[PDB]
Design a protein around this ligand. Structure first.
Ligand SMILES: CCCCCCCCCCCCCCCCCC(=O)OC[C@H](CO[C@@H]1O[C@H](CO[C@H]2O[C@H](CO)[C@H](O)[C@H](O)[C@H]2O)[C@H](O)[C@H](O)[C@H]1O)OC(=O)CCCCCCCCCCCCCCCCC
Ligand code: CLA
Ligand code: CLA
Ligand code: CLA
Ligand code: CLA
Ligand code: CLA
Ligand SMILES: CCCCCCCCCCCCCCCC(=O)OC[C@H](CO[C@@H]1O[C@H](CS(=O)(=O)O)[C@@H](O)[C@H](O)[C@H]1O)OC(=O)CCCCCCCCCCCCCCC
Ligand SMILES: CC1=C(/C=C/C(C)=C/C=C/C(C)=C/C=C/C=C(C)/C=C/C=C(C)/C=C/C2=C(C)CCCC2(C)C)C(C)(C)CCC1
Ligand SMILES: CC1=C(/C=C/C(C)=C/C=C/C(C)=C/C=C/C=C(C)/C=C/C=C(C)/C=C/C2=C(C)CCCC2(C)C)C(C)(C)CCC1
Ligand SMILES: CC1=C(/C=C/C(C)=C/C=C/C(C)=C/C=C/C=C(C)/C=C/C=C(C)/C=C/C2=C(C)CCCC2(C)C)C(C)(C)CCC1
Ligand SMILES: CC1=C(/C=C/C(C)=C/C=C/C(C)=C/C=C/C=C(C)/C=C/C=C(C)/C=C/C2=C(C)CCCC2(C)C)C(C)(C)CCC1
Ligand SMILES: CCCCCCCS[C@@H]1O[C@H](CO)[C@@H](O)[C@H](O)[C@H]1O
Ligand code: OEY
Ligand SMILES: [Ca+2]
Ligand SMILES: [Ca+2]
Ligand SMILES: [Cl-]
Ligand SMILES: [Cl-]
Ligand SMILES: [Mg+2]
Lengths: 81, 34, 334, 37, 30, 341, 57, 38, 451
């Protein structure tokens, strides 16, 4: 052994489950809402199913300049009106 | 007799907390429609 | 002792430099035939019409191949799965044109290797060993069957059996990807975990045992002289090795049981390769890799490519180009 | 489809073929309960 | 941004909760 | 016994997970590389770099998610969050492929950390550092495939993208463009990995099947004491068995295990050398004699020329979607196709 | 005895013979440079720096 | 609270079933909505 | 709790059922319970299929493997294999399901309530593995039972409805078998055929007469063998050739099952008589041939002379010769010229595909069939996307021939592995070194050195 309490002990203790029957679902719900609110989309810049193309466009918004790439993506985004 | 907030505790949780959050996210994603 | 009794005792004798045994009785001639025919063919066989479209492919050294390009070429598509022994041909010239050497070799070899496995059981029995080395060997052998017998049965022709050659082996893999998307097959994936993982554990076991060797030599001599063949004492400190590895990860990820550990060392690559063989064997009947072609779709219905679609483009390249003169109809159904 | 009268059990019937597999899992539960002695 | 408070409210409620439940043993340890 | 040495004391405590001086490098870099991969494959697209969906959020599955390489236009930019491209914007950074370089760099420093850990722990326990040494092969492969190869090529774009399907595409690309299977360094790699797996299998099975009966059980795992002095299996019986089965056999245990280290490590190292070659397009693509003969003689065919036809198909059919920055437009009529297909 | 891959370790505690081995290595490298230069001279065509410079050759 | 109150085999079974549940959900997602090809 | 830990039994939990080897009662329970599992899956899977079954779609578009088995026996279908009444299917499911309760019950009883050993209870039901006589007797019993089953197939075919006959004159239909093939020349003739192309061993059987006759022969042979083994005990040479232990017997049966699995794989992959393509979909050969047929028909409607059309290779584009002369379909499907099927045979004459028949006699139902079979080739992905690996998502289809063939090759393989395992272990155990080498009696150490 190396001093820490056995996991066998912990995960079968009543207390552990009192704590984690709260904390585990809490987190889970938080991740859920992170998606369902749409927050994720905006945090990582990921296209919603209606934001990959404009209505009549079929050209991928490929980044083509290195240093003005940011303005390029911003333009690509404004292109969806 | 036993400590609670060991190095092991930390390691365990830096892995486990994000994992449950992430699984909640992916769960949610399963009901997204085009 | 009578003549048959003596002969029996020689055959099954534990003292022959190379064990014969009853499986060896079949193994030795079949493997000799396959071997001889293979060497002569690889050096000197004329071009073979693999795809039965009178487009003979040259596999031998004398006919323009090196070691890397050379091959004993699979028998003609016109033959399909028909048995094509030498005596079915009107002449050796015909036999060679139609790829007879290939059938002679893969059948003699398959029989011979199956008997190799049996013989491993047999000697293990004669020496008072436990019997399952042959089970380990069943994995590479089943693989051999998969690419030389089973896949041709599924596809209806020995012309799709793996070629006996380096570049022909690559030909086989590329066409297999084209038609079965083997890379996206979970059994090929398990096979890769079997060989990558086997290689990992090989290096890891080797390195751990090497790392914990007990000091028995000087710096001016090889440490290998510190082990003597047959010595009863183990030659490395497994406690020190376990201490190392256990601390490298965490204690209960490590093996303290040499038997458990060696059993793992056998089971992981063997099982993995079993799934590889079964992969080839079931794609033999056209149960293919995952097909997520055009699986992601935007709100209007535009296809959004994933990496799966780029894989699909590559597969299309292979598909349209392979056997460029052999298809007259739009669907490559075999 | 099943005869109309049994339509009620359609969900149940969608689930039945898997029940054999549960037995394999059950063997493990049982084993865990006797500590894999 | 309301979505960050809506989403990361369960996490901070879990943290506050477990802090409440483990506080005496944590103080005893520290 | 000053702060340095007190710190050293703490670092080397024998806890559940050993930390060490090497832990300081290793744990944050490994954590951020794994976390980068999970974050990316769960939430981040590849629309603006490859025109690909690559996350769970978009509808990809475990096989098709990936953290994709950045746009070809980014070149070999470190692509730092605070760099001239993202300029501090976390979202734009994700959109530009910042996560790729994040994961590759934190990953490389993590691997360094892990090897340092192998050295450190070996030195604390008093064993020879052969595990670290063996681990030089994983390092050679990662550095050659993920750093050197794209550094020879136009940009990070052509590095492998971190995902299952993505890696499969990397393989297929390497076959079509580099004829990688023809490369004798790759072939030595294959020999090293398959030989390695073989040694794993055959050694494990041999030990398991020349065990001494050391207990009464039919399940013979308990009949071994981790502290025992005696060999648990018969090296002599093993040696005779293989000598009679295969012709030759190991007689020396030390050599056996050294060999087991040598074959896969060497294999991976050779494969690395090959990829360093491919970084420059220094391929083993053709046999010149082959091409001269085939060019002059339209009846001369080998599996070598067959595979080249396949490669040409791969290039033509995958290039336009796989290399979007080139704006390839290949009209139907120019696509290489055999009859009917 | 010493295995083949260790034959050179005999230099580890002999600064003289180590310096000597290093002198021999330096000799071989210099000799390689000189030889290589001579071969390039025997084969180089100086007649056209424009369409046949050294790197084409 | 004391370690050992809840039987490890019950914890094993429940955790197991939950794993089967979430992976079940994910394979259900293969056929519904995004990634379904429909 | 007798023999229910490692300490007492010798066997670890993962080899747990090896603790049952000399506990005849409990092992009886395991067996009856397992039989219950199998009957359960049959019934439940049948009802599941039936619920998910749209009668106007072909079965093979609906991922069915059991309803096809029921239809082949002639229940529920009429001409062409059209589903005319689902009820028999229903019956077959429910009855199987009901039965699995009974079996389950018995299993569980004998498993955990009944006598743990049967020998002290009944000398009739108790057995010793080493008891060669009793073994051959039980074997005999079960041979009699098997014979009875094969005879039940015979009786279905001859006295209770008949079987589905894809070869029936005028179109596939359920037909009564009145004149089964009884000639041993034919029946065992099949057994002595090469397994290679154009021969196909027993897989080649292509008429219901040979099937019924075969099963008659098998019924008698099995009952007679059954009685034979009930009445005799193994002969000397038998005694000296075999390992007589539980694990050895298991190993023999495992080898047999491997053999049978491979055979069933080939059966479902090539045969379209006992696996009618109406129910199971076309064989691979069938579909490839069907493509050839389909484009011959198309291009010939467009005014092409398909007999003289030379392809790019110099071989005919539509028609060419087999290595023995027969006129066969061209393109890659040249490999499949041993294919035979009711929609193709009206175009076949003594020298093979007949050109005048092809020009003048192709009926619309033949075009239809060729199109259907060409477009339901047994190619498809693991997530059931119909078509070649490069086909886009749209068609939900993997042939039941693929499903069945692949499943049974896997099971045949692992069962071969299992036979190696248990045969080798049976040998070592019988000889007494299954647990390892006696350090003080290491056999090799008493052998002369190799060199
Ligand atoms: C104790 C045993 C010891 C054995 C020792 C070795 C003895 C030789 C065995 C040879 C086995 C390989 C031969 C080739 C197998 C094959 O071509 O199999 C195919 C044949 C089927 O033949 C096909 O049969 C067809 C019959 O269908 C015909 O009839 C039908 C009637 O409906 C249809 O009309 C159909 O369209 C029509 O064509 C045709 O003749 C085809 O041309 C023909 O190819 O299967 C069959 O004969 C029966 C199935 C045999 C088993 C298949 C081999 C499996 C072995 C796997 C080993 C894995 C090992 C791993 C080790 C570790
Ligand atoms: C088809 C699968 C199958 C079957 C039929 C069996 C059967 C058996 N096993 Mg095996 N086993 C299996 C798979 C199976 N096992 C697997 C997968 C493992 C690895 C986990 C094992 C590992 C194992 C070990 C280590 C041992 C056994 C033992 C046994 C025997 C006694 C069990 C007992 O009395 O415990 C008592 C069990 C209970 C009291 C719980 C209830 C069990 C019943 C059967 C559940 C009934 C549920 C059912 C739905 C009810 C329907 C009723 C209705 C029809 C009226 C029994 C014959 C033991 C043995 O050999 O003893 C001599 C033993 O030690 N097994
Ligand atoms: C009729 C068929 C049959 C029968 C009656 C037996 C019987 C036996 N086998 Mg054998 N065996 C068989 C076929 C059979 N085997 C096959 C086909 C193989 C090749 C894989 C083996 C390989 C084998 C080995 C290596 C060993 C045995 C052993 C044994 C003994 C103990 C088995 C046990 O308790 O396992 C308990 C059951 C388990 C631990 C569960 C197995 C888990 C499997 C691998 C999962 C398979 C996945 C599933 C099908 C699909 C996934 C479902 C999931 C997602 C829910 C027992 C006499 C042991 C022995 O030697 O005893 C003397 C032993 O060591 N068998
Ligand atoms: C299939 C294998 C099988 C075998 C070899 C046995 C053997 C035995 N059983 Mg068990 N049992 C079984 C299955 C089996 N049973 C099933 C399926 C059930 C649930 C119904 C039971 C429920 C059961 C109970 C409750 C008891 C036994 C008992 C016994 C013992 C006394 C037998 C006797 O004297 O009956 C005499 C035999 C007859 C009166 C004739 C039987 C008539 C048969 C069943 C008609 C159908 C025959 C036909 C072949 C069935 C085909 C089924 C097939 C389609 C699946 C004997 C060891 C007794 C025992 O263990 O004592 C301690 C006992 O009390 N059995
Ligand atoms: C469940 C099926 C089954 C099983 C397990 C047995 C088992 C046995 N039988 Mg029995 N038998 C059976 C059914 C069965 N029988 C039936 C249905 C009949 C009526 C036909 C008989 C008639 C019978 C007789 C007359 C005798 C036996 C005998 C025996 C014993 C030794 C047989 C032997 O060594 O075979 C191994 C087989 C051989 C040694 C044959 C030669 C080996 C060649 C190489 C086999 C090649 C097969 C080939 C690969 C198959 C491909 C297809 C082929 C047709 C071309 C053994 C206990 C003998 C005995 O001891 O009785 C007490 C005996 O004299 N049986
Ligand atoms: C003979 C075996 C067999 C065959 C040929 C089929 C075939 C089919 N099934 Mg059925 N089924 C089976 C057994 C079989 N099943 C079993 C055992 C169950 C209970 C779980 C079911 C319950 C079932 C349901 C509920 C459904 C089907 C459906 C189907 C159809 C779609 C198949 C599919 O998508 O699979 C997907 C493929 C996989 C999941 C791959 C499995 C890979 C396995 C796990 C590998 C195992 C390897 C080995 C055994 C492990 C050994 C370990 C080793 C170390 C030794 C197809 C016709 C579907 C249908 O279309 O109905 C009309 C459907 O809805 N089946
Ligand atoms: C992203 C930003 C990055 C910037 C840097 C910010 C983080 C710095 C790196 C921190 C890495 C380690 C964090 C966890 C340290 C820890 O667990 O100490 C555990 C200690 C002592 O625990 C005691 O420790 C011992 C057990 S053991 O040491 O954990 O093994 C034991 O002796 C005793 O009983 C027990 O109570 O408790 C603390 O006070 C932690 C202080 C905050 C850290
Ligand atoms: C990037 C970045 C970062 C980081 C972040 C992090 C650190 C994260 C982490 C994260 C995480 C950490 C996550 C996790 C997740 C997890 C998951 C999501 C899982 C899942 C799982 C599963 C799904 C499972 C499955 C399975 C298997 C595997 C086998 C067994 C069975 C089963 C099937 C169950 C920072 C901020 C610094 C900066 C910026 C950038
Ligand atoms: C004595 C004397 C003299 C002389 C000298 C001389 C003359 C010298 C020479 C020298 C020389 C003349 C040298 C040379 C050298 C060389 C070398 C040293 C080389 C090496 C090589 C190598 C090493 C290679 C390798 C390889 C290969 C082969 C393949 C590819 C890869 C590689 C590159 C690796 C004088 C008079 C002056 C004076 C004094 C005295
Ligand atoms: C021994 C043993 C074992 C096993 C066991 C077994 C395997 C059992 C089985 C059992 C069985 C095998 C059972 C069965 C049952 C069944 C039932 C109970 C059924 C019922 C049914 C019903 C009630 C039906 C209904 C209906 C109708 C009538 C109509 C239609 C619809 C429906 C479906 C609703 C284990 C491993 C656990 C472990 C321990 C030992
Ligand atoms: C139903 C049917 C049929 C018929 C069938 C039959 C009639 C069958 C028979 C079958 C048979 C009749 C089989 C047999 C088999 C046999 C076997 C499979 C054998 C085995 C053997 C063994 C295994 C042995 C071994 C050994 C050796 C070799 C040496 C010494 C040692 C020992 C003894 C171990 C047909 C097709 C017409 C049609 C369809 C339906
Ligand atoms: C990098 C490590 C540099 C250690 S620095 C070292 O530290 C001691 C206290 O630990 C001082 O007492 C000493 O004067 C100082 O040189
Ligand atoms: O792949 Mn593609 O698919 Ca199996 O047949 Mn049709 O073409 Mn050809 O003859 Mn070798 O190969
Ligand atoms: Ca919508
Ligand atoms: Ca008897
Ligand atoms: Cl090709
Ligand atoms: Cl074609
Ligand atoms: Mg979805």
């Amino acid at each position: 052994t190396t001093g820490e309490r056995p996991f066998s002990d912990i995960i079968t203790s009543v207390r552990y489950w009192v704590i984690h029957s709260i904390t585990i679902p809490a987190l889970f719900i938080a991740g859920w809402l992170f998606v369902s609110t749409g927050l994720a989309y905006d945090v990582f810049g990921t296209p919603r199913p209606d934001s990959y193309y404009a209505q009549e466009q079929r050209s991928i918004p490929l980044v083509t300049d290195r240093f003005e790439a940011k303005q390029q993506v911003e333009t690509f985004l404004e292109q969806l009106k | 007799s036993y400590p609670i907030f060991t190095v092991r505790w930390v390691a365990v949780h830096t892995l486990a907390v994000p994992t449950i959050f992430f699984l909640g996210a992916i769960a949610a994603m399963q009901f997204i429609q085009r | 002792a009578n003549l048959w009794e003596r002969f029996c005792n020689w055959v099954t004798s534990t003292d022959n430099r190379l064990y014969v045994g009853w499986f060896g009785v079949i193994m030795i001639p079949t493997l000799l035939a396959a071997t001889i025919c293979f060497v002569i063919a690889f050096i000197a066989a004329p071009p073979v019409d693999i795809d039965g479209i009178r487009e003979p492919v040259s596999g031998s050294l004398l006919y323009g191949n090196n070691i890397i390009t050379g091959a004993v070429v699979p028998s003609s598509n016109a033959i399909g799965l028909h048995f094509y022994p030498i005596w079915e041909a009107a002449s050796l010239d015909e036999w060679l044109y139609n790829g007879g050497p290939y059938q002679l070799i893969i059948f003699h070899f398959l029989l011979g290797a199956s008997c190799y496995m049996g013989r491993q059981w047999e000697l293990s029995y004669r020496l008072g060993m436990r019997p399952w080395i042959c089970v380990a060997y069943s994995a590479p052998l089943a693989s051999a069957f998969a690419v030389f017998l089973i896949y041709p049965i599924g596809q209806g022709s020995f012309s799709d059996g793996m070629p006996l050659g380096i570049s022909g082996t690559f030909n086989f893999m590329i066409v297999f990807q084209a038609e079965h998307n083997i890379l996206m097959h979970p059994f090929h994936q398990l096979g890769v975990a079997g060989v990558f993982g086997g290689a990992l554990f090989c290096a890891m076991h080797g390195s751990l045992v090497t790392s914990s060797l007990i000091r028995e030599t000087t710096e001016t001599e090889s440490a290998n002289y510190g082990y003597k063949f047959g010595q009863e004492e183990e030659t490395y400190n497994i406690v020190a090795a376990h201490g190392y590895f256990g601390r490298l990860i965490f204690q209960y990820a490590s093996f303290n049981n040499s038997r458990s550990l060696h059993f793992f060392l056998a089971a992981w690559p063997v099982v993995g390769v079993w799934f590889a063989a079964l992969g080839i064997s079931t794609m033999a009947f056209n149960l293919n890799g995952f097909n997520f072609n055009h699986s992601v779709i935007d709100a209007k219905g535009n296809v959004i490519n994933t990496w799966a679609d780029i894989i699909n483009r590559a597969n299309l390249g292979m598909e349209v180009m392979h056997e460029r003169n052999a298809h007259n109809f739009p669907l490559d159904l075999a | 489809k099943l005869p109309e009268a049994y339509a009620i059990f359609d969900p149940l019937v969608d689930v039945l073929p898997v029940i054999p597999v549960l037995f394999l899992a059950l063997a493990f539960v049982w084993q865990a309960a006797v500590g894999f002695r | 941004d309301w979505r960050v408070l809506v989403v990361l409210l369960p996490v901070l409620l879990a943290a506050g909760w477990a802090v409440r439940n483990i506080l005496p043993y944590a103080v005893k340890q520290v | 016994r000053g702060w340095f040495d007190i710190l050293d004391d703490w670092l080397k405590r024998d806890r559940f997970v050993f930390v060490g001086w090497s832990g300081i490098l290793l744990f944050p870099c490994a954590y951020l590389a794994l976390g980068g991969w999970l974050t990316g494959t769960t939430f981040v697209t590849s629309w603006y770099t490859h025109g690909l969906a690559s996350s769970y959020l978009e509808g990809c599955n475990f096989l098709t998610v990936a953290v994709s390489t950045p746009a070809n236009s980014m070149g070999h930019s470190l692509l730092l969050l605070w760099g001239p491209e993202a300029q501090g914007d976390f979202t734009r950074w994700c959109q530009l492929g910042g996560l790729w370089t994040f994961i590759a760099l934190h990953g490389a420093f993590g691997l360094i950390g892990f090897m340092l850990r192998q050295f450190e722990i070996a030195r604390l326990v008093g064993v020879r550092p052969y595990n670290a040494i063996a681990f030089s092969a994983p390092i050679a492969v990662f550095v050659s495939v993920f750093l050197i190869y794209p550094l020879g090529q136009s940009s990070w774009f052509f590095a492998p993208s971190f995902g299952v399907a993505a890696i499969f595409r990397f393989l297929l690309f390497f076959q079509g463009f580099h004829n990688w299977t023809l490369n004798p360094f790759h072939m030595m790699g294959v020999a090293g990995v398959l030989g390695g797996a073989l040694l794993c299998a055959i050694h494990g099975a041999t030990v398991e099947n020349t065990l001494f009966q050391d207990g009464e059980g039919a399940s013979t795992f308990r009949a071994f004491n981790p502290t025992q002095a005696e060999e648990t299996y018969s090296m002599v019986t093993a040696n005779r068995f293989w000598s009679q089965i295969f012709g030759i056999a190991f007689s020396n245990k030390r050599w056996l295990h050294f060999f087991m280290l040598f074959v896969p490590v060497t294999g991976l190292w050779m494969s690395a050398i090959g990829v360093v070659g491919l970084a420059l397009n220094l391929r083993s693509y053709d046999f010149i004699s082959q091409e001269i003969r085939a060019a002059e003689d339209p009846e001369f065919e080998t599996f070598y020329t067959k595979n080249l036809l396949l490669n040409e198909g791969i290039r033509a059919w995958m290039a336009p979607q796989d290399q979007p920055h080139e704006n390839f437009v290949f009209p139907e009529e120019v696509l290489p196709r055999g009859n009917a297909l | 005895g010493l295995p083949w891959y260790r034959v050179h370790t005999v230099l580890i505690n002999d600064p003289g013979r180590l310096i000597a081995a290093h002198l021999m290595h330096t000799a071989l490298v210099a000799g390689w440079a000189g030889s290589m230069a001579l071969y390039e001279l025997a084969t180089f065509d100086p007649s056209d720096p424009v369409l046949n410079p050294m790197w084409r050759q | 609270s004391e370690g050992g109150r809840i039987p490890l085999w019950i914890v094993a079974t429940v955790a197991g079933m939950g794993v089967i549940v979430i992976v079940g959900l994910f394979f259900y997602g293969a056929y519904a909505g995004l990634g379904s090809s429909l | 709790a007798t023999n229910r830990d490692q300490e007492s039994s010798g066997f670890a939990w993962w080899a747990g059922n090896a603790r049952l080897i000399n506990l005849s009662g409990k092992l009886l329970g395991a067996h009856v319970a397992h039989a219950g599992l199998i009957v359960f899956w049959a019934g439940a899977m049948t009802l599941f299929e039936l619920a998910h079954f749209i009668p106007e779609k072909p079965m093979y578009e609906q991922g069915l493997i059991l309803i096809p088995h029921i239809a082949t026996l002639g229940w529920g279908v009429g001409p062409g294999g059209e589903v005319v009444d689902t009820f028999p299917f229903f019956v077959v499911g429910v009855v199987h399901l009901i039965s699995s309760a009974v079996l389950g019950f018995g299993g569980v009883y004998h498993a955990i309530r009944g006598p743990e050993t049967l020998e002290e209870y009944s000398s009739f039901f108790g057995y010793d593995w080493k008891d060669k006589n009793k073994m051959t007797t039980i074997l005999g019993f079960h041979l009699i039972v098997l014979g009875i089953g094969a005879l039940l197939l015979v009786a279905k075919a001859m006295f209770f409805g008949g079987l589905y006959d894809t070869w029936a004159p005028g179109g596939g239909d359920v037909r009564v078998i009145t004149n089964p093939t009884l000639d041993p020349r034919v029946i065992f003739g099949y057994l002595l055929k090469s397994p290679f192309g154009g021969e196909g061993w027993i897989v080649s059987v292509n008429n219901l007469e040979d099937v019924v006759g075969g099963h008659i022969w098998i019924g008698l042979i099995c009952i007679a063998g059954g009685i034979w083994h009930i009445l005799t005990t193994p002969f000397g040479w038998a005694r000296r050739a075999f390992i007589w232990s539980g694990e050895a017997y298991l190993s023999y049966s495992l080898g047999a099952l491997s053999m049978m699995g491979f055979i069933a794989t080939c059966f479902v992959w090539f045969n379209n008589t006992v696996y009618p393509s109406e129910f199971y979909g076309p064989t691979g050969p069938e579909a490839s041939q069907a493509q050839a047929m389909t484009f011959l028909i198309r291009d010939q409607k467009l005014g092409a002379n398909v007999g003289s059309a030379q392809g790019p290779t110099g071989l005919g584009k539509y028609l060419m010769r087999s290595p023995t002369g027969e006129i066969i379909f061209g393109g890659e499907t040249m490999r499949f010229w041993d294919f035979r099927g009711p929609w193709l045979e009206p175009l076949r004459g003594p020298n093979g595909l007949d050109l005048n028949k092809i020009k003048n006699d192709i009926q619309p139902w033949q075009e239809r069939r060729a199109a259907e079979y060409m477009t339901h080739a047994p190619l498809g992905s693991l997530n059931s996307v119909g078509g070649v690996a490069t086909e886009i998502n749209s068609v939900n289809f993997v042939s039941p021939r693929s499903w069945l063939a692949t499943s049974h090759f896997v099971l045949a393989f692992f069962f071969l592995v299992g036979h190696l395992w248990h045969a080798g272990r049976a040998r070592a155990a019988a000889a007494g070194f299954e647990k390892g080498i006696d350090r003080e009696s290491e056999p090799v150490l008493s052998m002369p050195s190799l060199d």
